[PDB]
Amino acid sequence: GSSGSSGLFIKNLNFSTTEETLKGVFSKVGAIKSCTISKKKNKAGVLLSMGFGFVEYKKPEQAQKALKQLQGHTVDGHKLEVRISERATKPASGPSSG
């Protein structure tokens, strides 16, 4: 019984994709409060995405819109998975090699 929260979880983020571009695409809906993509220090030591990130908005609404509004958008030839951050259901990340 509570509607209204900030934050957005993204998946399938092309390693090539950057924070700048992400802000632009999301900047269409409204003013972004804070954007941070899951990036770690690799062998080289460069901040590279991990295929997912977290976008924040100034108001719950904006996030509620950009959620699906941005969903389906063909980015880098691949579609991203947008979800309402802070969701009870945990993301099931399957393996790749095998």
- The CATH number of whichever domain residue 46 belongs to comes to 3.30.70.330
54 strand-pairing partners: 9, 36
Range of the domain at 91: 1-98
Query: Number of folded domains in the chain?
Result: 1
* Strands annotated E in the chain: 8-11, 32-41, 47-57, 74-75, 78-79, 81-83
The Cα-based distances of 71 to 45, 65, 68 in angstroms read 31, 10, 4
Question: What gap in Å lies between CA 84 and CA 42, rounded to an integer?
Answer: 28
The set of residues, in sequence order, having a beta carbon less than 8 Å from that of 56 and lying 6+ positions away, is 6, 7, 8, 32, 33, 34, 35, 36, 63
Locus of tokens 């209204």: 4
The Cα-based distances of 34 to 37, 96, 98 in angstroms read 10, 30, 37
Encoding tokens for residue 29? Answer: 């809906």
Q: Are strands 47-57 and 74-75 parallel, antiparallel or unpaired?
A: unpaired
How was this structure obtained? NMR
